[PDB]
Design a binder for this molecule. Structure first.
Ligand SMILES: [Zn+2]
Ligand SMILES: [Zn+2]
Ligand SMILES: [Zn+2]
Length: 100
């Protein structure tokens, strides 16, 4: 039992406690949306994690994302580019990311 009609993020859709704390958090994330997927029940702070997982969401059959060359499950396509570019260059090593 409660009501909220103002003091909420235009991008989270989540109610808050003060319009300035609303403003500063809406800048310190940006991200996209409440990070929440509507097809998975998943969320994580980055921007491009969601826009990539969104455009890679097409009829995966399992309501969870996976590397279509492995069949191996992984949260988002940005972590897969970092898996694929090194977890497939030496044999299935300690997942140490695409970097220089
Ligand atoms: Zn927000
Ligand atoms: Zn999803
Ligand atoms: Zn893979």
């Amino acid at each position: 039992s409660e009501g909220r009609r103002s003091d909420t993020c235009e991008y989270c859709g989540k109610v808050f406690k003060n319009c300035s704390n609303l403003t500063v958090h809406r800048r310190s994330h940006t991200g996209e949306r409440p990070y929440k997927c509507e097809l998975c029940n998943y969320a994580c702070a980055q921007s491009s994690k969601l826009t990539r997982h969104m455009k890679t969401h097409g009829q995966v059959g399992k309501d969870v994302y996976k590397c279509e060359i492995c069949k191996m499950p992984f949260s988002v396509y940005s972590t897969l580019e970092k898996h694929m570019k090194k977890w497939h260059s030496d044999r299935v090593l300690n997942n140490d990311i695409k970097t220089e």
